[PDB]
Design a protein around this ligand. Structure first.
Ligand code: 9WN
Ligand code: 9WN
Ligand code: 9WN
Ligand code: 9WN
Lengths: 445, 445, 445, 445
């Protein structure tokens, strides 16, 4: 008609309807068909969206994810649903069940990790539970009793095994670990990934998303799948990966999230009387990774750089990852003002052709910008939510509110799209994406 | 805390979460455990609550109900879920699968009917679909193409087989057909139901609702189950029921709903160019049952009476059914003003001890009033919704708005209870009741 | 910026801020500068807008208007603010203070009337007061005691002096009495107004609204001002006007409003135990003017026609006044369906170039349509409100809701414009128009 | 009736209606009758409440206040409305027009100051203006050009003349300068004020508020009015006040507000390219007064203490002023956790008998607590707003949200009371208090 948008109550209802519709029982799929399994950072955001509906079911979501945690503490980025096909690479291609000595016996998983937003979900669950009364607080507190150790082991694995040199930045062995598969951030590192004898495969993602402008290329998937062959050759052994992987990058955005997550989990630990040594370690890691993020930044603009460990070079790109230091703090005053000017100016939120005042995944003025192509340009509601929540935590109440307002406007069509075209607002990627519904649910209050 | 109520967006989200949680696939249970099957008038209200979430799934709900329609047109009041136990009387006790020649081959059902609110659900589906654009309008219009004949056959069975004498009132053979099992309306008729050799049975309803003050008595269930034996003895044959049933009442509230439903379906038929003869029949029945309702009314107060066909006597009770004429219209001006004074005065919505300005199922000043006991007093959100929608259709915009406002206040605890204590607001009956969530969903807009 | 619309709470606050800003103390101006006095039907809508803010002040607004009522019962269409210039024709031009024996001694007023929406405002005040508690109900009931007789005298003057032949239509002697100065409705009647020696004047309205496309022409004003000379020459004597006025029309929209207002006031009289003879007269007039409206209607479409008393001919134009029978009822079922099809189709609300699904003052497909020119095309929020309220009173809950939704969308710029361009949504006429704020407040209060 | 609360849109409308009603033209009175003039920190909150309604009028409010600024930079706490009586002490009693060489020539003012919340109001005006488009941004930027120097002179007067020893705390010479006339904070200092021959007077405040339990005693007013005699005797000369005043206290809450205001104004200066030397001074003062606040704090709880300059002793009381360090920051991590535990525990927001989870002006468990008596116990909406805004600025998003939620619940009666009884929620003090409406509008605008 004249207005296809939904009212706040309609939109909240449809978002909860979606989330319950993607529930398999104890895990929520990231999307109905494109991503028909549990993903790690999606599961954190799903728990955030479930917290206003059922603290009990939000806790179940994190319990299911943690039940897939590897023996060394790694949370793998996919927990596969039993008997479900339709996603590639699936369990047979990872072969972690037969090759990975640390993989769980009772879940099929991938063999790589994803960003540690999980502590933020725990905070939102606790915040909801404290408004709901004693029986609900008891549910959330029982979850802390049951899973505090597992959360510690997750943060410790990141701090000790992916920051072996105590640089305060997380090393990745796959671009998929960044959450941003085809981000321009990784192009120069991927250009040095030379596949050898790569076993034949058929993609499934572009059978579901048929528009070729919206997904990575075959050449990019060849490199993604070649890194799997390198990992499988060493049976996913942490100790051997630095010797064999053709892709080794320090991810400054993942690092900033980790800093925030450690500080959040330390505050939880203080409030719920968790072991002093754990809280002390969490604060130490929060500070170490805050400093590691700051060390990457341009001394003029504050923009954070990734680092190619193999090439030994800073990776200078124009993506939303540059704003990593805004999430965790630590910049000198003048540098942070410069970085905020970059965020709000014509290269990002201030670009005159954007439909919404939101943060594109790649700067529209970058040569790498592609308005439809996944992480090369589109606006991702999950990043809107993460930036808005971290900005509110910095004390930037109006900046956070504006992102939430624009994210709700963008989402008001009810498509709950994976990402959106930055100029037209066209929904792109999968529809019915669980963390887009969760973002709306958290925002609407 | 200081305030356990939910905001409108929170409440809408939780109501949709509930509705999707009670979805078995193609049917929604009336409640998670007490009523773990599809009920007929509940399914209409569920379709109303689904319409803002998914016109496609709202249509599915009515398709599933109509697929259980009997060969003679009757919509049975329970469509049992395959393999589901926990409700008594269940499929084995009804034995319609082996005894009822008109029962559907591919569904297990009860052998009695329930009120014809279904046309109202169709109207709400169409209203939503018209705001959503062409593909959604096509879904709703395709449903009309597919099911108009079945809806006609339902209304025709009521008009021809339950009003054989063309009195403009529907005859019931079981109090369960009224929707109000233990209403004081039926006490004097039930007092003449003398069970003979009644086969042993174990109730399930009071294993789930253990508080004896909230459910009918064993003596009442003995009579409910004896009527089943009388119906089974004649193989549920319409032609033989008047000769054998110990309970035969004309239900003025069911009759008023039928009048409204015929008028609504006639208006749909005009708008979507359905057969002229059908629309003509629907308007004729709407007028006949409006007149039949008016004929029951007290000439002073307008209060509508039920009629005991066996005793040949008007049934004078003080329940919400007295307000039947307000739903369908037809009263003389002075009589309708008197009936509205009764509704708004100290015997119903104006009673000084009520927590909310809502319509109790039995007048709190009646000797039959029991504040916890099912239809003998509690406030039912489903009746709030039905009265508010019919009042808005009369043009009584402020009266309708006040009922909606108070119903939302009552529902703001998020219990989605089956019924509520009228003085304290305590949630009673089953929690997580589907038509209470549907009422909230329709209201919140 | 990206979206310059206000939220509902922002919009409600700004609407109330406007209405208080236009308050001179005991009267609210219709606008800040263009209309810096009290107008009669505006004052009724202002009272509706004040009722959610202050029942006491809403009652004051109507008391002030009724203190200007003429000795014969006429409510004049302007009550001038003492010492205020800036509007023409002003008190000196009307000369009612020196020429009109029935004009009030203690107010300066115009010498013509305006539509009787006042009973609708009384109903809204009473509805608000009944939600607010005993002290506020007493305020509203005291107003009824004080002003019931004046309201009766107003209705009686219309029924007896402007329907002298008991035709059930109100005769007007000036297009300004219709509320729609330059409606195409009056063009052929105005073509038969031939001014004599008209005293020189200077307009004020087009000094404030300088865009010539938005106000009537000088030629139109010459005729408006000449009719004043004709009234002044007979000292505004009711009995003489039929013999001297060059403009005499039966206004079918005014007539339908009067039918509704009589029925509304009759219901108020019953509820508050006013004299039975008054209630009986009100219902008689409601019926007479309903029938009078229906008698004008097109046999195919149901559209209502005005009547030129001097030319003795039906006035056939394509304006929103055609929809008069929808307000008061009375059409046969088939013809009202045809009239609603006209309303919702491509000649009015369904025209494909309209920005909002609202009723233009003149059909966009009529040769008379002018998209900027006052009553010749623009969308008026006051008419949106009146149609929405009357439609809800007919029982057409969804139709009323859609008009309210589109009216709120149009008003969400916060300009509170007098009227809006139908295709672009550009605000036109005066900004900060009191009855546009009142519509918004009622729709949200 | 059943619930006398207003909806958010109703409440926002009534709040704006109130604020416009208290507008005299270019100044808004703090209340209709009790406070019928402009007060300094009220005017800052009024500007915050006007910003969502009219950036232009919000700017006017601060322009009017700053036009009363004294020649030395002091903003006086009252700007009297010309020709208005009804408040005591009025202009004749202050005699600043004849005795104070620094008082403005064209305004009548008091001779003491009030807390510097004004920069917070400027920030809110700028935030609103940036959402409204170019013309509105220009209005706000023009105000900065016109008044930046005056704002600097205000901050400089506080830092240089009320912190002469650079201790980082503001000295007051009257309890009225704290904003909290009869706070238990000042009881021991007031016990050392011995009036001489005090000129006879009659109070006005307790003729308007007649309940003696709600205002200070005559004995307290004798001391308030005697301090005026001491100031008048030295012609309000800043350099003489330390030698003659019987009341000299360092106000830690005023100091923390000043710290925040300096940081806020410094950020405004950076964003709008104000002189670098001014920004540098503002950040220096922000740091100095932060440290000055922290130096007062209890080593166990972190609670901030006031200081009696004459008695040379720390003032230890149990009032909301203890929470000053939460506003400005600076406490060590462990002590701020202790201070938040005090805030949220049973001595303040977690007291089990409080109707709302809000901060009482005096702890309910203190021997000084009086639940009706002005600053000795009642909950003040203005403090709820200030704490919520400062908490959001610290990053404590959920804590700020809970204060806002409870503040809106308390205000939903629409009384807009000056303060509220902490246990019953009874509205106390003046009704229709401007800064209570402003808090509501900001929380909803
Ligand atoms: O493209 C893919 O196959 C997967 C690879 O893990 O990645 C996409 O989908 C995941 C689930 O929604 C997200 O977690 C990622 O952030 C997003 O990029
Ligand atoms: O008590 C029962 O076993 C059943 C008998 O049909 O009845 C109750 O539950 C049904 C499903 O919710 C409702 O349809 C009825 O209105 C309500 O009275
Ligand atoms: O143009 C004018 O001078 C006057 C003449 O009465 O008319 C306009 O202003 C009035 C006040 O707003 C409205 O009552 C009318 O409906 C509107 O047409
Ligand atoms: O009691 C009084 O006469 C005055 C003295 O300035 O103080 C009260 O009123 C002011 C205006 O509302 C507020 O600024 C104060 O905070 C409040 O305590």
């Amino acid at each position: 008609p004249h207005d296809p948008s939904f009212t706040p109550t309609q939109l909240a209802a449809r978002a909860a309807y979606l989330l319950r519709g993607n529930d398999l029982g104890t895990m929520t799929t990231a999307a109905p068909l494109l991503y028909p399994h549990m993903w790690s950072w999606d599961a954190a955001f799903v728990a955030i969206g479930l917290a206003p509906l059922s603290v009990e079911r939000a806790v179940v979501e994190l319990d299911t994810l943690l039940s897939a945690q590897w023996r060394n503490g790694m949370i793998p980025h996919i927990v596969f649903a039993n008997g479900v096909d339709g996603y590639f690479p699936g369990p047979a291609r990872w072969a972690t069940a037969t090759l990975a000595d640390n993989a769980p016996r009772n879940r099929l998983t991938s063999g790589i990790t994803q960003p540690p937003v999980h502590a933020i979900a725990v905070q939102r669950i606790l915040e909801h539970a404290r408004t709901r009364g004693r029986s609900t607080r008891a549910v959330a507190e029982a979850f802390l009793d049951r899973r505090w150790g597992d959360l510690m082991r997750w943060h410790r694995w990141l701090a000790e095994c992916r920051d072996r040199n105590e640089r305060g930045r997380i090393t990745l062995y796959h671009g998929w670990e960044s959450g941003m598969a085809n981000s321009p951030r990784w192009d120069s590192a991927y250009a040095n990934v030379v596949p050898g004898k790569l076993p034949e495969y058929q993609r499934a993602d572009n059978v579901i998303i048929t528009d070729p402008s919206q997904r990575p290329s075959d050449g990019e998937y060849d490199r993604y799948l070649w890194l799997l062959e390198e990992m499988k050759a060493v049976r996913y052994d942490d100790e051997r990966l630095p010797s064999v992987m053709s892709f080794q990058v320090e991810d400054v955005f993942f690092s900033a999230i980790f800093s925030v997550a450690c500080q959040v989990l330390a505050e939880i630990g203080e409030d719920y009387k968790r072991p002093h040594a754990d809280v002390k370690d969490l604060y130490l890691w929060a500070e170490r990774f805050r400093a590691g993020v700051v060390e990457t930044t341009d001394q003029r603009t504050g923009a954070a750089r990734d680092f190619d460990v193999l090439a030994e070079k800073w990776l200078v790109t124009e993506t939303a990852a540059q704003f990593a230091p805004l999430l965790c703090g630590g910049l000198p005053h003048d540098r942070e003002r410069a970085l905020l000017k970059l965020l709000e100016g014509p290269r990002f939120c201030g670009h005159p052709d954007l439909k919404y005042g939101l943060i594109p995944s790649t700067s529209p003025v970058s040569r790498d910008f592609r308005p439809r192509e996944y992480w090369r340009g589109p606006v991702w509601p999950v990043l809107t939510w993460l930036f808005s929540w971290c900005f509110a935590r910095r004390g930037w109440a109006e900046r956070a509110r504006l992102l939430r307002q624009e994210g709700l406007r963008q989402a008001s069509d009810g498509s709950f799209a994976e990402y959106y075209e930055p100029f037209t607002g066209e929904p792109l990627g999968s529809m019915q994406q669980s963390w887009t519904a969760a973002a709306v649910l958290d925002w609407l209050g």
